[PDB]
Symmetry: D2
Subunit: 149 residues, 4 copies
Amino acid sequence: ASQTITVGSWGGPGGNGWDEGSYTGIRQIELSYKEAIGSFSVIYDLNGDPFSGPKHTSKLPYKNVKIELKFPDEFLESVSGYTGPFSALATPTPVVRSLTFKTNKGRTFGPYGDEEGTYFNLPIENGLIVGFKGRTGDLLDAIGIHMSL
Amino acid sequence: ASQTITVGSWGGPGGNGWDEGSYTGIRQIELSYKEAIGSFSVIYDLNGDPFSGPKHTSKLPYKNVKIELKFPDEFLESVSGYTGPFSALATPTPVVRSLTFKTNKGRTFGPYGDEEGTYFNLPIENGLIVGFKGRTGDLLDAIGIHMSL
Amino acid sequence: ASQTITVGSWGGPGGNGWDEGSYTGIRQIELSYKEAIGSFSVIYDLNGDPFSGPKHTSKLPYKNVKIELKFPDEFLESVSGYTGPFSALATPTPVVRSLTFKTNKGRTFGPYGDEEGTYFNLPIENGLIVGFKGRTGDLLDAIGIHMSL
Amino acid sequence: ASQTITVGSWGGPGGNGWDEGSYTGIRQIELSYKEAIGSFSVIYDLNGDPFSGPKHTSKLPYKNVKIELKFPDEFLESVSGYTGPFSALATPTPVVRSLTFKTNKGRTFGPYGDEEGTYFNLPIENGLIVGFKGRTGDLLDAIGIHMSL
Ligand SMILES: CO[C@H]1O[C@H](CO)[C@@H](O)[C@H](O)[C@@H]1O
Ligand SMILES: CO[C@H]1O[C@H](CO)[C@@H](O)[C@H](O)[C@@H]1O
Ligand SMILES: CO[C@H]1O[C@H](CO)[C@@H](O)[C@H](O)[C@@H]1O
Ligand SMILES: CO[C@H]1O[C@H](CO)[C@@H](O)[C@H](O)[C@@H]1O
């Protein structure tokens, strides 16, 4: 059972948890958004071959978007976003409202979802986001990260 | 030259940089504070023997404080705080204003320094803060972290 | 691109190289043998689900064998074997003649293949064999290992 | 308590154990030898400054030798040697009789001590020997290694 530095879990305890696990790297990210982040599934790299992980999609009719990294020369060097409860979707607990990624090549994938609530930002100076972990219900209640060299 | 996952660097580009490096674990943290964090030096564990790292002290007449962890049964599981520019000490760039630690034993070392500015929080679910990195001038301009299993 | 401590490469430069990569752990090992080791393919654990890696089989009509580890309570704690050139199969370079595994549960999978040539033994005191690397032609010319915590 | 992949422990159970721990790298190695290896102490690199670890010296009047690596451009890429019991020094258990190092720059520090007994060889394809572990009595009964990226 090898283990991987797991960091954070930003967001609330709502929805059901999920942990896609560790892989060799990240190739593509797919997420839906509107006033908050809804669906979130990612395509990892498993030793050279692309491996699509579990789909954590939500029913909310949100705008979808694909984030294609120019792997393996380009990789996430920063993950930041906003977390706060959502009124329209009657649930008392916090939800990831906004998410925004930044790659080592200078490419930043603009903030998806409203930018309001308490801020969180993970600047990676040395290391690789090798996998995602998080909780999903009708939206993305929380999101976590696996890292390695 | 062996390397360690390095994360963050929360705060501004002011002052001079410093990186204390990687060690086996953390035993004691010493920092001075008032409206922001000033001095910051830590005592690591180098294979069982306590090893005091470089002192990054500031002249500002601030209130000092020692944080003694009950090593190795107790270790930091969360580091959070605030970063924002400081008026009184004329400098245009952001500074770590507040810092607050939480150990796996439930012990939280209350927020030191004013809690205003943009928030940052590093929840550690699996891994160890094995070393600090950061920038100091008259205060603690920024602070970073080294992690490992 | 998430790298993993890679060790050894015991054996000769004959045949074609191959690297199955890193995974979460090892579940089953399949190898054929006679006077030396011929086919060698393994089934890894990818975050809980069994993942069969590339088949590196050889044509030689050798006796096959499956090594099923009681994962995840049981794992390899030692890999040792013999390397030396082979007469019968006219090739001037060394080949892994014998291979023998030992698990943390005391189970040792007896030496497969003749035990002659120069000896090699990797005792693992702390760490996990998380993936194999090696060269195959008509037999297993050499074998390597990926490790992680 | 951060941990490091620890490998091997080649040699016998004689003498008293010792573990110098993990450091940033290796700068110099000092060992004494004759028909077997006697004294063995090393100077590590602790984040840039040379750090001398525990001296594991033996009284046997052996020939001493210093191995200075051109750190950090040069580092051990292979450690091999011989282990077998020693007659002259009446002890029934195995002892490391010979030890030989090879650096990434092509420099090989010739076999020290008689080359007889069972062979052991650790080729490092990716990773760093970051610390030694071993057992010493009147000679070097066994030797182990800590590795990391
Ligand atoms: C209102 O319903 C769903 O979505 C919210 C936020 O995603 C969760 O907290 C909740 O448990 C349900 O899964
Ligand atoms: C005003 O002087 C000092 O302290 C501030 C904040 O610590 C730094 O930005 C600056 O460069 C100096 O080191
Ligand atoms: C004789 O043929 C094959 O097998 C040997 C040993 O496996 C290799 O060295 C060689 O290149 C071929 O692949
Ligand atoms: C004969 O005396 C010493 O040295 C040998 C080999 O080093 C050890 O096995 C033994 O316990 C003593 O420490």
